[PDB]
CSV table of C-alpha atoms in Angstrom, one decimal:
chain,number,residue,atom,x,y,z
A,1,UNK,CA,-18.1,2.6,-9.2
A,2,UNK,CA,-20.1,2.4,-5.9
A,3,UNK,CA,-18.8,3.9,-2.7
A,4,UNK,CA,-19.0,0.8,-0.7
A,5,UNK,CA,-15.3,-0.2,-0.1
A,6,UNK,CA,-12.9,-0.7,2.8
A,7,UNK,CA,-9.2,0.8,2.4
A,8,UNK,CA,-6.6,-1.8,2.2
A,9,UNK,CA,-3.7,-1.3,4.5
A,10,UNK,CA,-0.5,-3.0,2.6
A,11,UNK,CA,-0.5,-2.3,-1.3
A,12,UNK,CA,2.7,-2.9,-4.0
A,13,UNK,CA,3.6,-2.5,-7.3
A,14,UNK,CA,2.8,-6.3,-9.0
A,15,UNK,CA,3.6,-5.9,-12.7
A,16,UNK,CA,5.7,-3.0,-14.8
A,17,UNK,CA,5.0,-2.5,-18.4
A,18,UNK,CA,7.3,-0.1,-20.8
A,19,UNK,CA,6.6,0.7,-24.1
A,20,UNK,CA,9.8,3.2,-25.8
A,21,UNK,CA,10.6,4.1,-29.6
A,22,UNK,CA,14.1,3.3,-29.8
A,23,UNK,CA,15.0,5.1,-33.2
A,24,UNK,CA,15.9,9.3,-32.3
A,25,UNK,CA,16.1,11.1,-35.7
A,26,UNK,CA,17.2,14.1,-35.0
A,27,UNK,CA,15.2,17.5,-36.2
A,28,UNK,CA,16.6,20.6,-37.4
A,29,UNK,CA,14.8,23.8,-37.7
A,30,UNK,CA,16.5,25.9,-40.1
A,31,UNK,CA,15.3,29.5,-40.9
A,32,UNK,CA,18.4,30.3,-43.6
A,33,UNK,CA,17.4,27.6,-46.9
A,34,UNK,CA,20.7,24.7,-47.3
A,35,UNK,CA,19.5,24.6,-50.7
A,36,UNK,CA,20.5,27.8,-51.9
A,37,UNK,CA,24.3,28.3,-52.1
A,38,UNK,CA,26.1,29.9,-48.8
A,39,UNK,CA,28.2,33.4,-49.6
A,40,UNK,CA,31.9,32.7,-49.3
A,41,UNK,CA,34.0,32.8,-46.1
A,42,UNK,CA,34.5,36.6,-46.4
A,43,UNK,CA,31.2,37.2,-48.2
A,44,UNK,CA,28.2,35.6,-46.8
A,45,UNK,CA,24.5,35.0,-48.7
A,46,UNK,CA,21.3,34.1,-47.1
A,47,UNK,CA,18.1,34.1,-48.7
A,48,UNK,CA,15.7,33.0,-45.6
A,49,UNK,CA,13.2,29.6,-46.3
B,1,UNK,CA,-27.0,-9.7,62.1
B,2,UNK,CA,-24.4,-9.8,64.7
B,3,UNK,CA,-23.8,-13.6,63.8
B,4,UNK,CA,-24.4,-13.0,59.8
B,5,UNK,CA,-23.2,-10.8,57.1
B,6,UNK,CA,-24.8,-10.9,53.9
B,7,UNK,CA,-22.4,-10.7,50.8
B,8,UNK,CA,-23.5,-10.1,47.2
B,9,UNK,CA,-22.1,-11.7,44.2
B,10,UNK,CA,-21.4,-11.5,40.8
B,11,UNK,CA,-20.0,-14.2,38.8
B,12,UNK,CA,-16.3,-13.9,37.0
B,13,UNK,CA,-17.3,-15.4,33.7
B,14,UNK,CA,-13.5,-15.2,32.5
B,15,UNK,CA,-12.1,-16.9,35.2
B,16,UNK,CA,-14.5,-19.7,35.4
B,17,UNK,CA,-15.0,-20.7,31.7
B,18,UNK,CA,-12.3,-19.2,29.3
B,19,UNK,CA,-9.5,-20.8,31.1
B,20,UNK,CA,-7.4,-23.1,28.5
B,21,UNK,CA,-7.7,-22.8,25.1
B,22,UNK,CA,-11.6,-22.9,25.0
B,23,UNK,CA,-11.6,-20.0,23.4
B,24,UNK,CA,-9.6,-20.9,20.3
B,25,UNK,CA,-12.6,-22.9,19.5
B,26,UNK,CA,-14.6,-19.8,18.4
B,27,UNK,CA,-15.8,-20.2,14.2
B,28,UNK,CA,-16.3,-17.8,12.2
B,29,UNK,CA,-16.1,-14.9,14.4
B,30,UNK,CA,-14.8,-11.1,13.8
B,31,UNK,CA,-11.5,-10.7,15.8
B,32,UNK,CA,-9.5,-7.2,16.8
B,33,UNK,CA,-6.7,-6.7,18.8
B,34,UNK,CA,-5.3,-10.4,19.2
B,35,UNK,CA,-1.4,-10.9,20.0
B,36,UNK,CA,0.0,-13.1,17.4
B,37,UNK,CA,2.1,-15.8,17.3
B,38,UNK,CA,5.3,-15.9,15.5
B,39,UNK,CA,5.0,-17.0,12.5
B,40,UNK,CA,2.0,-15.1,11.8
B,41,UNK,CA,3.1,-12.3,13.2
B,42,UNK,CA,6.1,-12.6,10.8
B,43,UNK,CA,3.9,-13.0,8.1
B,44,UNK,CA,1.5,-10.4,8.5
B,45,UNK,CA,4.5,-7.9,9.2
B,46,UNK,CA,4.0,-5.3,6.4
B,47,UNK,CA,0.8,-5.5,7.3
B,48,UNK,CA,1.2,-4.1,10.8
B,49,UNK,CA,4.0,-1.8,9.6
């Protein structure tokens, strides 16, 4: 960690590393409960979560 | 003098004792500035760049 250092002119990328997560569930924020029955087409029914 | 003139000298180090490659004898010795032949110069390329 000591300051005594001389720049180097030419520098490159040597070695790439990736680390990824390759399952995606998807999420799905829902204020209105699924588990409570929906209102019929012309008559709806919510009852929040 | 009308029948001398004195002349002063000082002596051409460069012409008299680097001539040839004497001076690629030189070990060990910090360099700057040098032209460079082709295939170095091809290899330190980046570098100059």
């Amino acid at each position: 960690n000591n300051d005594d250092v001389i720049k180097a002119s030419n520098k490159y990328y040597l070695n790439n590393y990736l680390e990824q997560f390759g399952g995606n569930l998807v999420l799905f924020q829902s204020s209105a409960d699924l588990s409570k029955k929906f209102g019929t087409k012309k008559e709806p029914n919510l009852e929040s979560s | 003098n009308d029948h001398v003139t004195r002349m002063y000298l000082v002596i051409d180090t460069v012409m008299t004792y680097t001539q040839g490659n004497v001076l690629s004898t030189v070990q060990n010795a910090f360099v700057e500035r040098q032209h460079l032949p082709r295939d170095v110069y091809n290899y330190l390329l980046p570098s100059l760049r």
